[PDB]
């Protein structure tokens, strides 16, 4: 398909790595006695193997020659669920801790105490702040175009040139 | 300057060079750097305070 | 009744005088060496310190040695304690060139030409104690195996 | 090997001779004054 | 609630274990009921 | 009276005040922050609590509680591990098939797919395997059911919430004084006669009442839910009087002195038990009754309130010769007024008992069914070996903290102390010269087999089959110790242990224990240890006996046990602390026990452990390779290390592979280790310094200053990351091999 | 000037004295005077009984006789003590404190060595000096 | 021997005298300071290149400057 790689639900090396899998919980499970809880555990992982190897088969992805599952991550709509949309979401929350933690660093300067704020949380406030974050971008974007997030050159520490 | 300013340091070897500190005495005599600045971040040797000259404080 | 004192009644140098360091026994013993004995010239001094050494020097290359197991093993081992002797020669040598300035005076081991003195005594006396060895163990069966001829 | 004598006079030689006058000549120049 | 076990529990070390357990319990609790996502489902 | 019990009545109140402000104990500290080297100076001097105050009083009750603190958590560990055992555990399986259930007690959830590490273990059992060896202890205890180990557990919780209390109780609310700590012959004659004597007294009662019959019902093949509960051993005299007929003799034997009567409970038998390849519990049971019968009496030479007794500082005075000027005149009040100089002398007694613990339950198991458990004995020596190797360096490091802080030259005017300082040269020069002799003539001999062995002259090398050197001085040890029973110990039946000589003792066609020989590699291998021993003794020495001052620093003592350096001057002074030649030592250390603790596994596996087949010949696990492959250091390369990590490297897929997946994260940690190691602190500040810069940019700079870490903190963090790799690399290492071969 | 008859404090001995680099190349001398006979620290390890009265001792280096200072001063209130350097052939310098007054007090008649008339971030930088024998500070 | 140079920033503490183990420093009468005094080197081949002074010094960035050089057998501290 894409990179000559095969869909997962079709490569029998796929289907391969599943029968094997399956066969070396079969053989731990034989020498239990049905009913023990040994027994229904290791049929409980069979369950989880056989439900994994199903859920990969049917989502459209690529397998390679190895048997195992391949992503791919040059920008193609196809596999966005692959690197794009889920890089998202830590963009999402990534974006979203340092903003708080920022926002939290501009309300220490004004403590009495700054220090005693950095190692003593206000945990009122720090509540306050990491529930600011569901707006971040919008947020932090009108912080930038205010003047207000980035300092200029000639108010910044610098060593000797 | 005066007492009380806040001030910032042109000094290039300074810890606090670029940055803000408070004037605590201006002394009158001919001292080659007579304005004492007090400053809230402790330097690497943990002072927080130095003796600058008049071109080397800017008020803010 | 202490027996470790400050050395040589200063107590601020860099020694102690212990039964180890300045007994009557050790003081005779340091004094009747070559090395410190008086009354001798520095070539007789490195003749009788070349014997001692060089005569002792034979015996583990004769019987460790790669040739141990052959015919040739008391040759060969003489032949390495010999070069093994050229080598400190020239380690004396090099040593009497670097450490002394040339003066006059040759009584002593820490001059120049008293330094070449015991060298060229070290030298003779090394050859002739390890000839002396190589002699007595080709000629005596009981030095060839150590021993284990009387069993 | 032609000239098989060669190996057997010179890697003694060039093994034991020469680093022991480089290391005693260097050892002289270095600690004359 | 006494104001100093409040500001002692408030402190980095004590708030850091809680909060890293609080987020391990929200990644082990999504991936015993939600297992095996190496992808976003389409 | 002179010992009497003196006691302060709420000297601290109970407050949570301090608990809000961190660095309180430290008048330095409790300013509060400014760097980041705040926190990590609040964290690495707390519980040092001489350098907070000068008064010896609060320190000692200071330290009496944190010791309450330490075995609340001992005790609680403990009660742990018995609940544990009684709800997590196969351990009733084990107790019925102890020759093919491999015990486990720790059980994993299913989360991520980890429930693979739930391993086959047997008795229908699935869990992680354990190797600490409790269950051997809970069957020579007599443990036959998971309700007793329920009920263990909750004497070990209510024990850990009575030591709490009292730890509460003794610093919060009646404080000893200093007079009650400074009684050093009270607290000997105490500890003596009560904590081990009385100990010893009532666990041989225990041993003698409970743990007799029921492993004796249990070696001879009754299964455990038959056995009698042990208050029907207790009250019934004619069901102990079956097994042991003596007790129908009752306690007139013991009081007449006919003891010879309790001959078949109270035995000397030695040697092994041959159905479970234990030391016999008679044997034992005489053993911690002698032991507290001396204790006790041990316990009454001190002085106290009463004219009896001996005094010790007319004991140390008293002894003085000519060699040696005053004495031992000075060290009483030195050790009952320095806390460091205890420390230091307990600790170094402390690791030397480990060691010996090591030695003697390898080579001597005391407990069933735990000789052919391989995985038990390697933990437990691998164990306590690096327990014994810590606590003596401790002893070292706190040994020199004494002699910075607490030495005063004045009270130890030509006594021994100010002796050894005054030929602190001679000393080290004596013991660097016979280590590089040492190393020279130990190390040569492995790296001259290498070069023969690689040049193809085999009979240049030192083996048994090549020029020799045989250990005859431990040869003719093991001949008059295998010679010692009815020759000069006419008593007993056996020999102590039979690694001296005698018959293949095995259990379950696994070798319990069999003779171990000692040729050129043992040799080659002691005098390695020999070597360093004595290299570790050099550097924590020359660290103790220069702590104060040296010919390079003469006012060392001024700037304390711990400093980075005294300037680049000097030519360059660093590392000149105390505690960086501890810093040193700690690496020899592992050096040290790494290298006994290969010796020994390879040793064990080549030609001890192995398992007995027909015509009674033992097939051995690597096969007898130790004689001829431990003369190199290629031979310990191939057939030792890449030989034996075969089972780490491909346990992935099977239960042993958390072993694997922790050999991996001990490789990465161990080598992050040296990235404080290796580097200094000039470098990572001026990077900060970047950092810092990019925080200023984004107005997101913390006002706690970020600092690089001390130059001591550097060494100390690389150290700690560096033992705890090379520690879990031959943790991993070696418990994938035992558990895969054994 | 240094008194050689000046007696020594009571010590046992070590061998943590002086090497022969101090009869071949420089020796130190300390002496100071005492109100009582008291136990002090060696500077090369050990402890020694001063006399009262005055007490000269021999040293390597300089360090270890105002280690020595050092402490006496901050451990007995001894601040009379001398410091000299003694050569082989017998000539004695004079060294602490040089002109009588202690060096963290200012005496009249000192001038200073090294003093730079700027400050250090002033100096110049290697390429104006690289090839010529001008100095970095100006 | 090493180089001990004393600027102008110098306040007239006194620290970096009393921190000196080798006596390389000395207070000398000076007119640009509060403190009338300034330090100076007139010792620094008894220099041992410590840098106790340095860390002494309580002036933002440092007064006194220890430059290390020649190695003689005092700089080196060298009991033999
Ligand atoms: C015979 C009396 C006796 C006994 C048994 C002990 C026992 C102990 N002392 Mg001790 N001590 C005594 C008298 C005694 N002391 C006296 C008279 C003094 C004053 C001179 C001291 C001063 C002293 C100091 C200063 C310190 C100790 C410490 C310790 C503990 C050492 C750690 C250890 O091995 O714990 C494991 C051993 C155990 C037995 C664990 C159980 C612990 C509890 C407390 C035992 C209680 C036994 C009880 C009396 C009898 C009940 C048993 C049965 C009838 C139910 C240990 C519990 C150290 C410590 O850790 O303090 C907390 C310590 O620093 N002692
Ligand atoms: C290494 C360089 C590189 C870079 C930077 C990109 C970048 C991109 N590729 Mg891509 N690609 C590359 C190499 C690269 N590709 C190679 C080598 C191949 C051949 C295998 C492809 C094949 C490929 C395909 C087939 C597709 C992309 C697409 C995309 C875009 C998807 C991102 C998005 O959501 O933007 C779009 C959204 C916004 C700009 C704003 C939304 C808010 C993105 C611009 C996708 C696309 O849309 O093409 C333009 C697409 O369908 N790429
Ligand atoms: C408030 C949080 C915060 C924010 C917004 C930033 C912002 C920045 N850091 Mg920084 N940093 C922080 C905390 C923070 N730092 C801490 C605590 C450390 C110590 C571990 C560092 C160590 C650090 C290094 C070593 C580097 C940066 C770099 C950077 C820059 C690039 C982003 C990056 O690499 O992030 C990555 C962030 C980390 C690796 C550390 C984050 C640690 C945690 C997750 C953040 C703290 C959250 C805080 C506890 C929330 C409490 C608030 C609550 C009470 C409301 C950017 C200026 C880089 C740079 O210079 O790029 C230009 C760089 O090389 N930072
Ligand atoms: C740098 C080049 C080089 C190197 C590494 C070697 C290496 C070797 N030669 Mg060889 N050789 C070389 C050049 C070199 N050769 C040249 C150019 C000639 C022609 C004259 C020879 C002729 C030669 C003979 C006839 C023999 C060897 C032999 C040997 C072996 C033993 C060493 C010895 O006795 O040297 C002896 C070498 C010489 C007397 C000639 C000097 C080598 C060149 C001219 C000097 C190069 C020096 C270099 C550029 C500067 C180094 C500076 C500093 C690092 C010291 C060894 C494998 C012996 C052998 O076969 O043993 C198995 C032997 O018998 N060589
Ligand atoms: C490339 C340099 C080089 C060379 C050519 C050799 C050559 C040799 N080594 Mg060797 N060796 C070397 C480097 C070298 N080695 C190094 C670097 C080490 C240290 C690891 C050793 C350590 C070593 C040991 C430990 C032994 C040898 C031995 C031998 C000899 C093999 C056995 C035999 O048949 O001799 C039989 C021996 C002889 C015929 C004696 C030769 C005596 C010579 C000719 C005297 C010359 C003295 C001197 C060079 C004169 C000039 C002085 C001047 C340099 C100042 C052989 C002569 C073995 C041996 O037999 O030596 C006793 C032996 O035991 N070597
Ligand atoms: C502190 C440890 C300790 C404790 C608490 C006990 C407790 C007990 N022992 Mg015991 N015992 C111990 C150590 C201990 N023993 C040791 C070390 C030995 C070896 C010398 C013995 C040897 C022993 C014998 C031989 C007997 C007991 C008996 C008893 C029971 C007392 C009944 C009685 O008075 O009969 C007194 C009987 C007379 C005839 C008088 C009681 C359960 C007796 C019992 O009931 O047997 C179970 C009994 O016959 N014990
Ligand atoms: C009987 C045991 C014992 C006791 C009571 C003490 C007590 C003391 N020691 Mg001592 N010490 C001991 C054993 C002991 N030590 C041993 C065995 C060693 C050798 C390693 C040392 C080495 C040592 C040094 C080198 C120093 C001390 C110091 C101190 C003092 C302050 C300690 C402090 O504040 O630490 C506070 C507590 C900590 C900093 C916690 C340490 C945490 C460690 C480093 C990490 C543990 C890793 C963990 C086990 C595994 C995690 C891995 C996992 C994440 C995968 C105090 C008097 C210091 C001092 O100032 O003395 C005057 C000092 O310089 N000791
Ligand atoms: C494998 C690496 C290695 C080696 C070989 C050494 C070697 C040494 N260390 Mg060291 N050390 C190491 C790693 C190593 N260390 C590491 C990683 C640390 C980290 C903390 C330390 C920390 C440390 C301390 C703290 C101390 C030492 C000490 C010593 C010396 C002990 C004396 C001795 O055994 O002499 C025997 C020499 C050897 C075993 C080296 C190998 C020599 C063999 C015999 C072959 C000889 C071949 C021959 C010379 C070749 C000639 C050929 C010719 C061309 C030159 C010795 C020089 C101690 C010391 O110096 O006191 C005496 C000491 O106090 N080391
Ligand atoms: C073994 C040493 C031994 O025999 O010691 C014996 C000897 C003990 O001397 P005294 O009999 O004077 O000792 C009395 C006191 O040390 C104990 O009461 O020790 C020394 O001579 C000092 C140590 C020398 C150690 C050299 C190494
Ligand atoms: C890397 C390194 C540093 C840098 C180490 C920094 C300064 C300290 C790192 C501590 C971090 C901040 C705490 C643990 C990191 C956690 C994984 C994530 C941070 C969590 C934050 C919320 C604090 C040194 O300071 C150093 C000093 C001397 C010799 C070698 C070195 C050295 O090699
Ligand atoms: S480096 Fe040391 S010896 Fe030199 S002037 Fe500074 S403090 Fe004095
Ligand atoms: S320490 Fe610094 S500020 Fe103080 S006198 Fe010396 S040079 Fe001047």
Known sequence: DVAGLTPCGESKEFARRLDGSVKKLQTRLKKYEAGTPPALALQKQIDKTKNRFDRYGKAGLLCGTDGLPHLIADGRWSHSGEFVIPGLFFLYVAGWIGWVGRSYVLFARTADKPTEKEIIIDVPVALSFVSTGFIWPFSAFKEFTSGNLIVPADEITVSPR | VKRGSKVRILRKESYWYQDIGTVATIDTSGIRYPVVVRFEKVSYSGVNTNNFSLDEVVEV | SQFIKPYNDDPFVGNLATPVSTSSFTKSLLSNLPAYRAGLSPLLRGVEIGLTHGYFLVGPFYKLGPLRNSDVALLSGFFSALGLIIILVACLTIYGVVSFEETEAKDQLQTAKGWRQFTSGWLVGSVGGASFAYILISNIPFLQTAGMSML | MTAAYLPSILVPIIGLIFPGLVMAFAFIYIEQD | ?42 | KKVSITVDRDPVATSFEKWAQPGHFSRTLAKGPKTTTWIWNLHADVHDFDSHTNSLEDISRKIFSAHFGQLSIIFLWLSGMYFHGARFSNYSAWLSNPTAVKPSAQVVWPIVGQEILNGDVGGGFQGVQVTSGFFQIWRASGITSEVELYWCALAGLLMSGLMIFAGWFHYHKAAPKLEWFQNAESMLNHHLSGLLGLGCLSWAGHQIHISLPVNKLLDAGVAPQEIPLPHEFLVNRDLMAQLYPSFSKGLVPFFTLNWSEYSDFLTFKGGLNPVTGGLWLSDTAHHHLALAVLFIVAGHMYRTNWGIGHSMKEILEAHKGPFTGEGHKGLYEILTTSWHAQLAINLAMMGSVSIIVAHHMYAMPPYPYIATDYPTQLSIFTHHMWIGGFCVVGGAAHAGIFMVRDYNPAQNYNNLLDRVIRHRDAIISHLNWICIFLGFHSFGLYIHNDTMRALGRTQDMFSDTAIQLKPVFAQWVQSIHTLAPGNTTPNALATASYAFGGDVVAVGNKVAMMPISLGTADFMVHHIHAFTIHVTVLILLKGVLFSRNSRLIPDKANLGFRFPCDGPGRGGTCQSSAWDSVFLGLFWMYNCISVVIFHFSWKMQSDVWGTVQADGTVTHITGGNFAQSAITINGWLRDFLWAQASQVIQSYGSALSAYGLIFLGAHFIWAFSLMFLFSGRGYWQELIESIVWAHNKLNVAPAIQPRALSITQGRAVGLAHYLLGGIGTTWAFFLARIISVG | TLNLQIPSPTFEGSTGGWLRAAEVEEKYAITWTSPKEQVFEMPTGGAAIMRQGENLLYLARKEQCLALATQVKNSFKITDYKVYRIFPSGEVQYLHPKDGVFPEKVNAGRVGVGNVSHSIGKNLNPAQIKFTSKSFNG | SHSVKVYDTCIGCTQCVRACPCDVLEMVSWDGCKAGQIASAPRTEDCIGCKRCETACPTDFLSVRVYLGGETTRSMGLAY
């Open chain 5, 1 to 42: 609630m006494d104001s100093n076990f409040l500001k002692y529990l408030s402190t980095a070390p004590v708030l850091f274990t809680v909060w890293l357990s609080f987020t391990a319990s929200f990644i082990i609790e999504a991936n015993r009921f939600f297992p095996d996502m190496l992808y976003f489902p389409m």
